[PDB]
Design a protein around this ligand. Structure first.
Ligand SMILES: Nc1ncnc2c1ncn2[C@@H]1O[C@H](COP(=O)(O)OP(=O)(O)NP(=O)(O)O)[C@@H](O)[C@H]1O
Ligand SMILES: [Mg+2]
Lengths: 198, 613, 561, 171, 258
């Protein structure tokens, strides 16, 4: 599955400039009208402020923690189209709808799948190989008003990714801190082989 | 028989583990494949024996003690590795059946088996050994048949067969009669297809222990070596060389019925696997050297730094040092389209009083030039200094041996008139030609000459003419670019400075020794040699109009103005000016000669010629 | 002129062809190296190829560009405000070993801090909540309380019945307080409350509560409750009386244990300091106040134990949220992550704490240094914070641990702020709110009995909340089934210290205010357990055990930070 | 490693290469010029009793130790191919003392394994030449010119023991 | 004379790959990722797909070995000390059990491809490794007297095979090898493929098999035990259905064979 298809429903990472407060979407090492990736790191095009590694990594971590807190807010939604009730209340049956007479199934409005895909989308933005191969989810379409006029060459993208390898690895480590604690990841063979326990 | 396969497998594991040898195979293959579509590199690889020790000790000792049983399967595995990698399709007829596998070579840590010809002993037979010595003889190159291909006229089938001889294989097989088959098994008459058959080159040499190790004036001892394929003609007599190969025996040793009563012993040889030279001149630059050489060249006064770094132990004589540096750089040799030749190399002469460091300074050039031959004027004859006949064969002299180098001649004044006149060709035409009984040939001699002499009266007499003081013909003095006169004038402060200088010199101690034990900035000589090599190879300054404007004016003024000048001025003086300007531009690493270079060359020539600046 | 002559003065005059000039100019502009640097690297390129004819052609320049990129990537690879019991108990003198330089092992006066929970159970993977598992936990809570109520009041199992079914006879019903509308709009009155039953008790159905016959009540969402009443009409369950939930038992110790703990302190009083984050203001990351506090801790206060609640690095800090983190000129190498920021700011300061002071660290769900972002929360990784093993202990959140005989119950979630009560009657309203909240915490036997957890929203966008992992809420219950002697739940509300049902309930307050002004911390002095002074209550049994009665023999001082 | 041991006193005087990390006034006499400073990244050869301290005392210490030639890779390969044939006396007179000192200084693990094998393999031929008593000179003498100063003492104290036992027995 | 004197998972796989080949005998333990599950299964699936493609193209063992051996270093390494490679190999096999236990056709195709890969990897071994691997599996040689009594018949049986399979054209070499060769006695039904080609000597319902042959017995035991395990794996597929995240991957894996 491509990153475009996998991350279709993910929220784009927005970074706020520490100097001029301008918010812009971050799409890795790509052409953008709001930021430029130089040999020194991320730079805002509005005021030419260079981002320190801490300023970038803290914003990434804040976005991750915001998504985790949104997940644990526990909003549930009924899948019945007629009812469509949204509540944080959980019945003792869990999946039973709390509206009287409704047979629909309650589900998390922000599922663990969506959170996991969001965290991977953040992880993909700081994967050096994906940046070199230009396999990231695009933050602009060709028909968008904010589509950049000047496009970075493939050689330029590879050179900038090599020059900024430390920064990308640091941000990816910040993302990987939480992905290692996500329960959706691993598969336990010890429990799985219950037939040999027959 | 089964053990052969397992050894091939084990060496395949070795080749897969240490990946730096795969890159060698692939790089040689792609290089050869590229230029084939338009030199070709040999199908040979050198392995470090230490890697094979650390990978598998049993295979390491097997190679090093039983080479006949371990070298062939490893070579087979290397051929399999190179064959499996991708290769150009549709090979020609000759390529299809070349019978040409890859081959191995070794380096590093032979231990006990590192030997010399004196100490090679019967205990070491069939072991893999390394020897050191001097080459004394070399045979002519000959081809050798190993395979032949035949076409059957009626059936249209191509046949072939293989041949072997005792020196062609490490293992031993029944010898082959070297006969070409004329007729098929089924009676069809055969034809031999040259060009599809395979032949290889062969050469024998002899290696002797170095004379420095000979005991008690005893007879020296020597070994014969066999070379083939790529190793041919990579040595000549007089080379100091280190050879790696298998030490083996041959022949029947008289046990096939003979009159000797078998007192005579068996014959022995070394089969050459790898050859390395010994330095006893050339150096190869690293990247850091290129960076330093380019950075240093932009100093304001590089010429002063480099010139003063030549022979720092000799006080004074700045201009002679600068002239020697410009000699070591040299001009640019021209060959015009109609075959005409214009000289490039600079010759220098210096004459002076006794004890004034002439021979000591002349000795310095011999130990910093890349190729240099030294001789004394009276210890050499004209034929010996140029060329001589022998048996008809013609043998080279000293000026012919140093072709693209420098030749140093001390005690030049003692050379007889009959010997001197042989040199008039070599210093301008740069060739030697002989016309004697049964011979006519021309030889090349492109060197630069530097020499020293004493004046006629024992010390230079200013109260007599320079011709009276310097008894040489005008036609000879014209051929020297720069002529220097030097004298020992007595003066208080000069004497004090020189005496303090030599006394400071004699108090040196080398680094690693305690006192009493027996044994501006100056660039080191090992760096200066690299600088000279790089500048001579990589930059070829072209002349410019601004330099010519200076050169023409200086030449015409110098020739016509009446002065007590100490050398005849001729058309060769203009060439001297051009050469010196080009050499000074080459010191600067400039791609073009500028006005500054011509100005400096003129100022040096004026000092040497008219004696004052 | 300039680029052309610069090339021609380093490269030969053969470069005068404008395509060659353009290519070399492109190289120097691409890679920022000067013309002479390009000439030097071209000379490097000319080496090692056996190519004496390294001519300055277009193809050679293309190979030189490839060489330059290879060299580039290879170079990259190379490279006192308030007080509880002030009149009866004096402030402790503290640990006498604090301030002594001696390397000698701290032999006698060793306050023992021991966790009273299974740390492995808190190391569960987050961000995966099965709705069925959560619902199982919620149902098991109702069933456990039903068993407790049945045993306490000696009721038969047949006395309990479904409150959602019409019945003319009075029945007993246990369930969870839930809103009458699933889409309720943040304000609950007594008339909008419903009771959710267990799967066994009422098949999980909800019934509206008619509380007209009840004069005094205090209810909150997620509370487990017990009612005696009837459903006469089938629409609402009329509550006739509320059954108070029994309080959990108090911890006890044997005479031998109390004598051992008395010998350990040599009859002196225990001193415990409790602080709660944040430890820097909202507009900077200055830890000057924390440094001054630690110097006071080491030189004047000299406590036996220091308890520090997070957040140490609050992820919801305004500078972190806005990305306006300052440069730290005091550091040679700037931090790159918030973990490195902790290691550069907090770790040098915390290491200056005396080794004789046992330091307990409890995380917050807002702490950037904790990857376990859910309540219940795993402990901080002490090695990752580079703190010494001798005197630092990282505990979970909530954490139950024992200091000598005293059982401490700690939860770093703001239960006091989050718990919103639906109250009726004059007597209930006249009572102090935090007393009622503490009693709700003790009766429910869980540090955070609210369900669904609180959320904070801004103009709506979700900011933060309790962040409850519902499947693991069993770890939030009181360990061992008894209340703590001292319960510490930090809250944004005003600091207090109170005795509620023989449990000392403490909110130390924030260490520093948002404006940078000094906040508050709690100093707890507990007198030594003495079998002869009468402050301990003997409980008769097979083996005689003693109630600790820490509330009779504890002083809590709320002190400006 | 006693204080008054002559061999330890003499072994500490061997020079090792060094590089500086601070410029210091007046210590140019180490560079044989008392009237000048030392400057950062200057390289000098200093005796071990001084470099052993200047490498430790601060932070960044004053001097960094460069890998000496007597522990180069070529020597290690020569050791590992054939330890018995090796001329350790030419490499350094006090090899096995400086080896232990360097191992203590840097806590090397692999160098210890190499050196232990070297000692154990050479002890065999040392015992062989010790045991061989006349009832020959060249065959013994060729090997005994490649012993360290360390090994000569063991050889002498073994030979004398065997000789004394033989003399007592056949008496 | 003188004289002197989870970790368990890693030790388990070191034990399992000491022989360099395994019958894939035991239940894995611990954890790996779901991405690893998919990718490892796809790698082994690619190798087995090429094996089945070459067999459908009727290519010989040598050609298949030439085609497949370069793919191990990319997809499924063999003869390796790496724990990652060993776990990759083991887990990929166990995953394709769950993919291909679903039907008789899938079971037959998977057994065929995996047994041929087993044969290929066994050929890569040294004789010592083959001996140790066979001995580890707990796998009757005839007496010297019985060999002497049947020496004429056994030599007549194997003499052509010695010439063609072991290249022993010289009868002297064949006699020496036969003098050094051992023979195995078992019922003729166990080696019936060799019986049909008359490659073994039959006496009283027992087939006499030389030691240099008989690898078909090893590969047939591998195939039979794999088939029985697949039948077992089929019976408890309802337990696999408890995790929905694995079923799309297995459906994708099986789609390439349908
Ligand atoms: N600056 C100096 N000037 C002159 N002589 C020097 C100087 N420094 C050293 N010498 C010594 O002078 C001696 C004579 O040097 P040498 O090169 O033989 O002079 P010379 O010109 O060759 N005399 P001659 O052989 O009669 O022609 C040597 O012993 C040198 O070491
Ligand atoms: Mg002289």
């Amino acid at each position: 599955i491509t990153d475009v298809e996998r991350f279709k429903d993910t929220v784009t990472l927005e970074l706020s400039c520490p100097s001029c407060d301008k918010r812009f979407p971050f799409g890795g090492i790509v052409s953008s009208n709001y930021y430029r990736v130089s040999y020194n790191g991320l730079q805002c095009k509005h005021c030419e402020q260079l981002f320190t590694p801490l300023q970038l990594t803290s914003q990434i971590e804040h976005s991750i923690r915001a998504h985790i807190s949104l997940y644990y807010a526990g909003w549930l939604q009924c899948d019945d189209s007629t009812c469509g009730i949204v509540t944080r209340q959980v019945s003792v049956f869990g999946k039973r709808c709390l509206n009287d007479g409704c047979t629909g199934v309650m589900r998390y409005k922000y599922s663990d799948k969506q959170l996991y895909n969001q965290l991977l989308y953040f992880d993909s933005l700081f994967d050096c190989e994906k940046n070199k191969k230009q396999e990231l989810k695009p933050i602009y379409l060709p028909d968008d008003l904010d589509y950049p006029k000047e496009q970075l060459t493939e050689s330029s993208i590879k050179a900038l990714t090599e020059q900024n390898r430390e920064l990308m690895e640091t941000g990816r480590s910040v993302v990987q801190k939480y992905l290692n604690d996500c329960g959706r990841r691993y598969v336990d063979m010890t429990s799985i082989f219950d037939f040999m326990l027959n | 028989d089964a053990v052969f396969g397992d050894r091939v497998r084990r060496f395949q594991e070795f080749l897969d583990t240490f990946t730096s040898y795969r890159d060698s195979v692939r790089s040689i293959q792609v290089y050869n494949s590229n230029n084939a579509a338009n030199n070709i590199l040999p199908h040979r690889i050198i392995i470090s024996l230490d890697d094979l020790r650390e990978f598998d000790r049993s295979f390491w000792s097997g190679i090093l003690v039983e080479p006949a049983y371990f070298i062939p399967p490893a070579e087979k595995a290397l051929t399999d590795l190179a064959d499996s990698m991708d290769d150009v399709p549709h090979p020609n007829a000759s390529a299809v059946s070349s019978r040409h596998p890859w081959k191995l070579s070794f380096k590093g840590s032979f231990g006990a088996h590192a030997l010399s010809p004196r100490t090679l002993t019967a205990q070491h037979l069939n072991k893999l050994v390394s020897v050191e010595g001097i080459v004394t003889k070399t045979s002519l190159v000959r081809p050798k048949l190993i395979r032949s291909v035949h076409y059957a006229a009626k059936t249209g089938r191509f046949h072939y067969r293989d041949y072997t001889d005792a020196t062609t294989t490490l293992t031993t097989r029944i010898p082959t009669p070297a006969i070409y088959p004329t007729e098929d098994t089924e009676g069809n008459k055969l034809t031999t297809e040259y060009g599809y058959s395979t032949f290889i080159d062969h050469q024998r040499i002899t290696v002797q222990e170095m004379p420095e190790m000979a005991p008690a004036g005893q007879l020296p001892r020597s070994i014969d070596v066999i070379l083939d394929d790529d190793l041919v003609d990579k040595t000549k007599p007089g080379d100091r060389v280190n050879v790696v190969g298998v030490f083996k025996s041959l022949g029947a040793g008289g046990m096939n019925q003979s009159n000797s009563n078998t007192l005579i012993g068996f014959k022995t040889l070394i089969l050459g696997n790898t050859v390395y030279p010994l330095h006893a001149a050339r150096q190869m630059l690293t990247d850091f050297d290129i960076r330093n050489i380019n950075k240093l060249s932009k100093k304001k006064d590089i010429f002063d730094i480099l010139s003063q770094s030549l022979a720092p132990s000799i006080y004074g004589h700045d201009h002679i040092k600068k002239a020697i540096l410009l000699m070591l750089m040299g001009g640019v040799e021209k060959n015009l389209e109609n075959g005409s030749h214009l000289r490039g190399d600079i010759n220098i002469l210096m004459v002076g009083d006794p004890s004034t460091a002439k021979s000591q300074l002349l000795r310095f050039v011999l130990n910093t030039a890349s190729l240099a031959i030294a001789t004394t004027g009276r210890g050499s004859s004209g034929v010996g200094l140029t060329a001589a006949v022998t048996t008809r064969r013609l043998e080279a002299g000293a000026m012919v041996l140093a072709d693209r180098g420098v030749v140093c001649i001390d005690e030049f004044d003692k050379m007889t008139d009959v010997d001197r006149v042989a040199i008039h060709e070599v210093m301008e035409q740069q060739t030697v030609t002989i016309a004697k009984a049964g011979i006519h040939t021309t030889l090349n001699a492109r060197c630069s000459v530097i020499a020293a002499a004493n004046p006629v009266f024992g010390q230079y007499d200013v109260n007599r003419d320079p011709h009276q003081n310097i008894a040489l013909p005008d036609s000879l003095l014209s051929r020297f670019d720069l002529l220097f006169v030097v004298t020992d004038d007595i003066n208080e402060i000069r004497d004090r400075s020189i005496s303090e200088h030599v006394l400071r010199t004699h108090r040196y101690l080398p680094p690693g020794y305690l006192e009493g034990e027996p044994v501006p900035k100056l660039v080191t000589i090992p760096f200066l040699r690299k600088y000279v090599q790089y500048a001579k190879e990589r930059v070829i300054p072209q002349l410019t109009q601004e330099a010519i404007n200076v050169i023409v004016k200086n030449y015409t003024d110098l020739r016509n103005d009446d002065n007590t000048k100490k050398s005849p001025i001729t058309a060769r003086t203009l060439e001297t000016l051009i050469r010196l300007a080009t050499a000074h531009a080459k010191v600067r690493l400039s791609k073009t000669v500028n006005k500054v270079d011509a100005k400096v060359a003129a100022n040096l020539l004026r000092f040497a010629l008219l004696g004052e600046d | 002129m300039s680029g052309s002559i610069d090339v021609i003065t380093h490269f030969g005059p053969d470069a005068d062809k404008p395509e060659i000039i353009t290519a070399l100019e492109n190289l120097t502009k691409l890679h920022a190296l000067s013309v002479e640097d390009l000439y030097i690297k071209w000379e490097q390129f000319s080496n090692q190829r056996r190519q004496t004819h390294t001519d300055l052609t277009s193809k050679n320049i293309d190979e030189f560009k490839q060489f330059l990129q290879l060299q580039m990537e290879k170079r990259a690879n190379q490279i006192i405000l308030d007080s509880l019991n002030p009149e009866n108990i004096e402030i402790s003198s503290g640990n006498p070993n604090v301030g002594l330089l001696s390397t000698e092992e701290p032999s006698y006066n060793q306050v023992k801090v021991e966790p009273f929970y299974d740390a492995k159970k808190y190391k569960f993977r987050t961000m995966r909540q099965n709705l069925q598992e959560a619902s199982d936990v919620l149902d098991d809570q109702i069933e456990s309380f039903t068993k407790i109520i049945q045993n306490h009041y000696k009721l038969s199992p047949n006395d309990f019945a479904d409150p959602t079914i019409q019945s003319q006879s009075e029945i007993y019903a246990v369930g969870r307080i839930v809103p009458d509308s699933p889409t309720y709009d943040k304000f609950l009155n007594p008339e909008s409350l419903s009771l959710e039953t267990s799967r066994m008790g009422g098949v999980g159905r909800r019934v509206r509560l008619d509380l007209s016959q009840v004069n005094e009540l205090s209810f909150f969402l997620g509370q487990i409750v017990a009612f005696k009443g009837k459903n006469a009409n089938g629409d609402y369950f009329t509550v006739n009386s509320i059954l108070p939930l029994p309080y959990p038992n108090s911890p006890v110790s044997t005479s031998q244990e109390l004598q051992e703990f008395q010998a350990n302190l040599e009859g002196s009083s225990l001193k415990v300091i409790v602080t709660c984050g944040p430890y820097f203001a909202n507009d900077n990351f200055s830890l000057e106040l924390l440094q001054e506090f630690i110097d006071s801790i080491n030189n004047e206060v000299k406590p036996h134990v220091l308890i520090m609640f997070g957040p140490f690095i609050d992820i919801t800090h305004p500078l972190i949220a806005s990305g306006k983190l300052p440069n730290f000129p005091q550091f040679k190498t700037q931090p790159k992550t918030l973990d490195e920021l902790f290691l550069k700011l907090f770790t040098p300061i915390l290491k200056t704490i005396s080794p004789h002071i046992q330091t307990v660290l409890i995380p917050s769900t807002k702490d950037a240094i904790s990857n376990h972002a859910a309540y219940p929360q795993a402990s901080l990784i002490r090695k990752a914070l580079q703190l010494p093993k001798r005197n630092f202990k990282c505990m979970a959140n909530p954490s139950s641990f024992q200091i000598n005989e005293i059982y401490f119950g700690c939860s770093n979630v703001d239960t006091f702020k989050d718990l919103k009560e639906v109250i009726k009657g004059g007597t209930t309203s006249s009572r102090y709110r935090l007393d009622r909240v503490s009693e709700h915490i003790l009766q429910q036997r869980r540090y955070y009995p609210i369900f669904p957890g609180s959320i904070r929203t801004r103009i709506y966008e979700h900011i933060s909340g309790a962040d409850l992992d519902v499947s693991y809420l069993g770890l939030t219950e009181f360990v061992g089934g008894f209340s703590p002697d001292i319960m510490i739940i930090p809250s944004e509300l005003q600091h207090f210290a109170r005795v509620v049902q023989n449990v000392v309930v403490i909110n130390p307050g924030r260490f520093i205010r948002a404006t940078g002004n000094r906040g508050s911390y709690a100093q707890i002095t507990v007198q030594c357990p003495d079998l002869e002074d009468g402050k301990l209550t003997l409980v008769e049994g097979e083996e005689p055990v003693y109630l600790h009665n820490v509330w009779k023999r504890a002083r809590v001082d709320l002190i400006a930070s | 490693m006693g204080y008054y041991d002559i061999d330890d006193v003499l072994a500490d005087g061997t020079e090792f290469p060094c590089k500086f990390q601070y410029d210091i006034p007046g210590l140019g006499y180490l560079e044989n010029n008392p009237g000048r400073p030392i400057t950062k990244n200057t390289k000098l050869s200093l005796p071990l009793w001084l470099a052993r301290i200047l490498a430790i005392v601060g932070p960044v210490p004053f001097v960094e130790l460069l890998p000496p030639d007597m522990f180069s890779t070529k020597v290690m390969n020569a050791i590992k191919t054939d330890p018995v044939a090796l001329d350790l006396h030419s490499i350094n007179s006090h090899f096995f003392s400086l080896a232990i000192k360097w191992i203590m200084l840097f806590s090397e693990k692999e160098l210890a394994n190499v050196v232990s094998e070297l000692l154990l393999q050479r002890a065999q031929e040392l015992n062989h030449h010790a045991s061989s008593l006349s009832i020959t000179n060249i065959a013994t003498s060729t090997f005994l010119l490649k012993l360290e100063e360390m090994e000569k003492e063991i050889y002498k104290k073994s030979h004398e023991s065997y000789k004394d036992t033989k003399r007592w027995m056949f008496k | 004379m003188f004289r002197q004197s989870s970790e368990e998972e890693k030790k388990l796989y070191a034990r399992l790959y000491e022989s360099k080949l395994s019958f894939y005998d035991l239940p894995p333990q611990g954890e790996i990722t779901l991405e690893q599950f998919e990718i490892w299964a796809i790698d082994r699936l690619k190798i087995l797909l090429e094996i089945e493609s070459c067999l459908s193209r009727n290519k010989s063992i040598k050609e298949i070995e030439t085609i497949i051996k370069p793919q191990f270093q990319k997809l499924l390494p063999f003869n390796t000390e790496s724990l990652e490679d060993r776990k990759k190999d083991y887990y990929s096999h166990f995953i394709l059990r769950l993919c291909f236990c679903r039907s008789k056709e899938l079971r037959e195709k998977f057994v065929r491809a995996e047994t041929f890969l087993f044969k290929i990897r066994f050929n890569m071994l040294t004789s010592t490794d083959q001996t140790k691997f066979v001995q580890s599996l707990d796998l009757q040689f005839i007496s010297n007297e019985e060999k002497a009594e049947l020496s004429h018949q056994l030599y007549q049986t194997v003499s052509a095979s010695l010439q063609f399979q072991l290249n022993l054209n010289e009868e002297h070499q064949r006699k020496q090898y036969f003098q050094q060769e051992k023979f195995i006695k078992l019922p003729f039904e166990n080696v019936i493929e060799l019986v049909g080609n008359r490659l073994v000597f039959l006496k009283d319902g027992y087939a006499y098999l030389p030691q240099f042959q008989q690898l078909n017995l090893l590969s047939n035991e591998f195939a039979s035990k794999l088939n029985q395990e697949l039948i077992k794996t089929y019976q408890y597929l309802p337990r696999l259905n408890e995790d929905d995240r694995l079923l799309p991957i297995l459906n994708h894996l099986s789609s390439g064979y349908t």
